[PDB]
Design a protein around this ligand. Structure first.
Ligand SMILES: CCCCCCCCCCCCCC(=O)O
Ligand SMILES: CCCCCCCCCCCCCC(=O)O
Ligand SMILES: CCCCCCCCCCCCCC(=O)O
Length: 582
C-alpha cells in the first residue's frame, strides 16, 4: 500500500484506531500521565486523516514503525523519565524499534489500581463516558505492556456494556460488582495465559509447543484431515513465536494472515467458523481462537488398528517419528474433546516411550500389544479427582469449599505465607465453582485452563520468595507434570507449630456489615493461622471451633454494644478453643 497509516485507519475505523494507538503508547511509555497520551493520540489521528484524504501527502508513505518511533522520539521527558530508552532514538529502523521493545517493563512498580465505589463509577461514566473508559484502558495497558492490544479492546467493550446495564438498575452495586469481578478475573487469566505460553516455548522448546497445538487444534477441528491440522500447527507456532518475540504490528499481521487462511478454507477445517469469519478484521483471529469444538465424525474406528495391531507400526514410526506421534495425537485428541490437552500429551509421551523400548526389542509386536492398558491410570487419575472435588463442592458450596481447601493446603505447605494460602485457595474454590457446573464431558478441559492460571500465580509468587523445595519442584517440572506434582504433595510432618498470638484471633464489630468478600477473607485468614498454630487439629475439632466462631459472630452482630461483645465474647471463644484443641 502507498500509505500503511491510511490502510490501517480505513480497516480499523477512527474509534478502534484511536483506542489501539492509546494502548500502543501506554505500553511503551508506562510512566507518562493520561493527558500527555491523549495529546499524542489526537496528533497521530489528525495525521492519519490527511493520509486518508491524499495518500501522497507529506510523510504518509513512511512505515508504521517509522511513524511510531518518530513520535516516541518527540516526547520531552523521554530521557528524564526513561533514561537509556532515549538513546534508542539515535538508531535507524529496524534497530530503533528493536531497542524500544527491549525497554518495556513487565513489572512496572505502579500502585495498585483502586476500584472506586459503585456510585462514583456510575456518575463518572454518565458525566464523561469517553474519558472514564479511556483512562481505565490506559491504566490497564501500562500495567500489562505485552497484552495483545486488540484483545484489550475486546474487554473494554465488555466493561462498557456492564456500566450501561447496571448503572440504570435499582440495585446498582449488586448488579455491577459481580460483573466487574468476573471481568477482572477473565482479564487476569488471559494475561497470565499469554505470559505462560511464551515462557513455556522458551523453557521446553518448539517441538513440545507443536505437540500441544496438534492436540488442541485436533479437539477443536476433528473433521479436518491430519495434513490440514499439521499445516495449521506450523502456522500457529510461527504466529506464537513472533507474538512472544515481537512488536504489536508483526504479531497482528501474522494473526490476520492465519485468520484469513482459515476463513478461506472453512470447508476443510470446521463448520462452526461462519459467524467468526463474517466479523470485522479486528475481531476475526480472536473470535476464531475462542470458537467451540466442531462435532466429531460418526463411527470413527479404534486407534488399535493403526497404532497397535498393524505389522508396520515400528516401520511407520521410524520413517518419521514426529509425524507418526503427531498422527497418534491427532487421532486420539479428536476422539476426546473431554480430555485436557496435557492428558493427551501424557498419553503421547507414554506411547513414544513404549515404541522406543519395543521397536528395539526381540519381538516388537508382542512388546507393544498392551500399550493402551498403560493409558488407563493416566486417564482415571484426573477423572477421579474431578468427581471427588466436585462432590465436595456440591455439599459445601463455594465458601465452605474454599475453607476445606484452606485446611488441606495449609497442612501440606504451612511455610507459605497466609495471604498467598488464602488467595490461592480462594481461586481454587472459584475453579470448582466454574467447572463443576459443567457436565462430565466438559469438566477436564475447563479445570485444565483455569488451574493452569491459578498454579501459575502460585509459582510466580513462590519464585520471587521461595519457601518450599517441594513447591519449587512442582513449579519447574514440565508443564505436563506440573499439576500431578501439586496433587502428589503430602502433609508436612516437619513443620514447627507457630506460637499463639492473641491479636491474630481478635475480631472487630465492623466484621458484621463489611463486604461479602472482605468478611470472608478476614475469616479465612484466621482459619489459616489456626491451622498453622494447631497443625495436628482433627476435622471434628476444627468443625467445633469453626461452629463456635459462627455462633460468636451471630451473637455479637445482634448485640447493642458490639465493640464490647467482640472483645469479651472474643476472649471467651479463644480460651474455649484453646482448651478443646489442647
Ligand atoms: C481444588 C480445585 C478444584 C478444581 C476442580 C478439580 C480439578 C482436578 C484436576 C483436573 C486435572 C487438570 C488437567 C490435568 O492435569 O490433566
Ligand atoms: C497449594 C497447592 C495447591 C495444589 C492445587 C492442585 C490442583 C488440584 C486440586 C485437587 C485436589 C488435590 C489432588 C490430590 O491430592 O490428589
Ligand atoms: C486457638 C485460637 C483459635 C481462635 C478461634 C478463631 C477461629 C477462626 C474462625 C474461622 C472461620 C470459620 C468459617 C465461618 O464459619 O465463617
Amino acid at each position: 500500500h502507498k500509505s500503511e497509516v491510511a490502510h490501517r485507519f480505513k480497516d480499523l475505523g477512527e474509534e478502534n484506531f484511536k483506542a489501539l494507538v492509546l494502548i500502543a503508547f501506554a505500553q511503551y511509555l508506562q510512566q507518562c500521565p493520561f493527558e500527555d497520551h491523549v495529546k499524542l493520540v489526537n496528533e497521530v489521528t489528525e495525521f492519519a486523516k490527511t493520509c486518508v484524504a491524499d495518500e501522497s501527502a507529506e510523510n504518509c508513505d513512511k512505515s508504521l514503525h517509522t511513524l511510531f518511533g518518530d513520535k516516541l522520539c518527540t516526547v520531552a521527558t523521554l530521557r528524564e523519565t526513561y533514561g537509556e530508552m532515549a538513546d534508542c532514538c539515535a538508531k535507524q529502523e529496524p534497530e530503533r524499534n528493536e531497542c524500544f521493545l527491549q525497554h518495556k517493563d513487565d513489572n512496572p512498580n505502579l500502585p495498585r489500581l483502586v476500584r472506586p465505589e459503585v456510585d462514583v463509577m456510575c456518575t463518572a461514566f454518565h458525566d464523561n463516558e469517553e474519558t472514564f473508559l479511556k483512562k481505565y484502558l490506559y491504566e490497564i495497558a501500562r500495567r500489562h505492556p505485552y497484552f495483545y492490544a486488540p484483545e484489550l479492546l475486546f474487554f473494554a467493550k465488555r466493561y462498557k456494556a456492564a456500566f450501561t446495564e447496571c448503572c440504570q438498575a435499582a440495585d446498582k452495586a449488586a448488579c455491577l460488582l459481580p460483573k466487574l469481578d468476573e471481568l477482572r478475573d477473565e482479564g487476569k487469566a488471559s494475561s497470565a495465559k499469554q505470559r505462560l505460553k511464551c515462557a513455556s516455548l522458551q523453557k521446553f522448546g518448539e517441538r513440545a509447543f507443536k505437540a500441544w497445538a496438534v492436540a488442541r487444534l485436533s479437539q477443536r477441528f476433528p473433521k479436518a484431515e491430519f495434513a490440514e491440522v499439521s499445516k495449521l500447527v506450523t502456522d500457529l507456532t510461527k504466529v506464537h513465536t513472533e507474538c512472544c518475540h515481537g512488536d504489536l504490528l508483526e504479531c497482528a499481521d501474522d494473526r490476520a494472515d492465519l485468520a484469513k487462511y482459515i476463513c478461506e478454507n472453512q470447508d476443510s477445517i470446521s463448520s462452526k467458523l461462519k459467524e467468526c469469519c463474517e466479523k470485522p478484521l479486528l475481531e476475526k483471529s480472536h473470535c476464531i481462537a475462542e470458537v467451540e469444538n466442531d462435532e466429531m465424525p460418526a463411527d470413527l474406528p479404534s486407534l488399535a488398528a493403526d497404532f497397535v495391531e498393524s505389522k508396520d507400526v515400528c516401520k511407520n514410526y521410524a520413517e518419521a517419528k514426529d509425524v507418526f506421534l503427531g498422527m497418534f495425537l491427532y487421532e486420539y485428541a479428536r476422539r476426546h474433546p473431554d480430555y485436557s490437552v496435557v492428558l493427551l500429551l501424557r498419553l503421547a509421551k507414554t506411547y513414544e516411550t513404549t515404541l522406543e523400548k519395543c521397536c528395539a526389542a526381540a519381538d516388537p509386536h508382542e512388546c507393544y500389544a498392551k500399550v493402551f492398558d498403560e493409558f488407563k491410570p493416566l486417564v482415571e487419575e484426573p477423572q477421579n479427582l474431578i468427581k471427588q472435588n466436585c462432590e465436595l463442592f456440591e455439599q459445601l458450596g463455594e465458601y465452605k469449599f474454599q475453607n476445606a481447601l484452606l485446611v488441606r493446603y495449609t497442612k501440606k505447605v504451612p511455610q507459605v505465607s497466609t495471604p498467598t494460602l488464602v488467595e490461592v485457595s480462594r481461586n481454587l474454590g472459584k475453579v470448582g465453582s466454574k467447572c463443576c457446573k459443567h457436565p462430565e464431558a466438559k469438566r477436564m478441559p475447563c479445570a485444565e485452563d483455569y488451574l493452569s492460571v491459578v498454579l501459575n500465580q502460585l509459582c510466580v509468587l513462590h519464585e520471587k520468595t521461595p519457601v518450599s523445595d517441594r513447591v519449587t519442584k512442582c513449579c519447574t517440572e514440565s508443564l505436563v507434570n506440573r499439576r500431578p506434582c501439586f496433587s502428589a504433595l503430602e502433609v508436612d510432618e516437619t513443620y514447627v507449630p507457630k506460637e499463639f498470638n492473641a491479636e491474630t484471633f481478635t475480631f472487630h464489630a465492623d466484621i458484621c456489615t463489611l463486604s461479602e468478600k472482605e468478611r470472608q477473607i478476614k475469616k479465612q485468614t484466621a482459619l489459616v493461622e489456626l491451622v498453622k498454630h494447631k497443625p495436628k487439629a482433627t476435622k471434628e475439632q476444627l468443625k467445633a471451633v469453626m461452629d463456635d466462631f459462627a455462633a460468636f459472630v451471630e451473637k455479637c452482630c445482634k448485640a447493642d454494644d458490639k465493640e464490647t461483645c467482640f472483645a469479651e465474647e472474643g476472649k471467651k471463644l479463644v480460651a474455649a478453643s484453646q482448651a478443646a484443641l489442647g
